[PDB]
Design a protein around this ligand. Structure first.
Ligand SMILES: [Cl-]
Ligand SMILES: [Cl-]
Lengths: 134, 98, 134, 98
């Protein structure tokens, strides 16, 4: 414990960013359309947050853990996975805008999903460690 | 903290480099070091963003970016998150040439 | 001088990278499709180099200087503008792969084209300054 | 030159930091400084790529990246461009959290 809470938090914080990237890659066609239509980075970020995104392949991955296990405790209820859609925070939209094109290639996409999947398993175990005395 | 501006306490260099900005992602705050960029008073725009704040007017010397011990970050005075895009673009320029 | 050459060389070097990005932006739909299809970054680079690209609006920009005025001296003839088509180097392909999604917004796109245009102006000027005594 | 590996000539630090890699774009070679990343012998994977080369087995300490005078890049021994992807990814993680 205490070490456990630190670990769980760090895993969720990292998973939270990867989750947004994975959702973006699952919707890359309309994501880039939306970005190209935006006159500025600020407006692209606003447009990314304005409407939710379909989960696509991420839906199946979330089955690797109980409901909302990857969700940071500090995340407000209006964000994250909600009824089959994903509601991005501004920080997540900024991570999407910071993706390099090379990240779209098959192996880079798979590597990102591999890290996110591994984190979900890591998170579920850290949770299981709790676990402890009530 | 990412884009937090810190007062340089080393009296020797504090005159030319009075402040520095943490540019390290908060996902790595477990590290005992921070990547920072020094600011210098205005006494290449794409590499060295001009910074106008309440503390004065500075050039961000992105090419003099360096890593420092986290204990050096004891005196936060401002935050530069509105400059995020300029700062990242300058770092990208230094490394990828874009 | 002996320093006019120095400036012309670095204008051409910077313009060479921006020119690749300009051609990519003029072809953004097929560029993205290529990169997504590629199973690896190495294969994306290969595919980017392997086929000529339409100049689009870059052809009109190239009128801001003489024929091949921005072409680096070291650049092999198999690369560059050949018969109205653009042949990228591996280094140029990597620059395209290094682009962050945020560079596709309207103002970022325009800022890149404007610097490319400015260099074409500088280059064309540094050229005529050469001559000067023979 | 970008991705060239240089020998650390400082006897006091050469044991722990035998080499450093230039990660600065060649388009900025006019600068009198270079952004470099130190290597340390094996004896956070995404941040600190493992580097197996003829010189030995190292970890790139991306977080300890620093700006150095160009004059100390006097002894190139290798070239790490096949590691470009890993190097850029590490820097992107350090700064953008990607
Ligand atoms: Cl809502
Ligand atoms: Cl302010």
């Amino acid at each position: 414990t205490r070490r456990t809470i630190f670990e769980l938090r760090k895993a969720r914080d990292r998973a939270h960013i990867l989750e947004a990237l994975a959702v973006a890659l699952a919707n890359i066609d309309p994501i880039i359309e939306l970005i190209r239509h935006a006159p500025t980075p600020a407006e692209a970020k606003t447009a990314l947050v304005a409407n939710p995104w379909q989960l696509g392949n991420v839906a199946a991955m979330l089955e690797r853990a109980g409901d909302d296990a990857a969700r940071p405790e500090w995340l407000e209820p209006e964000f994250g996975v909600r009824d089959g859609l994903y509601y991005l925070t501004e920080q997540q939209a900024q991570a999407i805008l910071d993706l390099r094109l090379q990240k779209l290639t098959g192996l880079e996409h798979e590597k990102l999903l591999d890290e996110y999947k591994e984190l979900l398993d890591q998170i579920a175990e850290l949770l299981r460690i709790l676990g402890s005395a009530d | 903290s990412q884009f937090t501006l810190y007062k340089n306490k080393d009296k020797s260099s504090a005159k030319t480099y009075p402040y520095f900005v943490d540019v390290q992602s908060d996902l790595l705050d477990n590290l005992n070091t921070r990547l920072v960029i020094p600011l210098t008073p205005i006494e290449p725009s794409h590499l060295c963003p001009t910074i106008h704040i309440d503390e004065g007017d500075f050039i961000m010397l992105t090419q003099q970016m360096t890593s420092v011990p986290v204990k050096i970050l004891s005196e936060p005075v401002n935050e530069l998150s509105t400059f995020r895009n300029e700062i990242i673009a300058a770092i990208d320029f230094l490394i990828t040439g874009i």
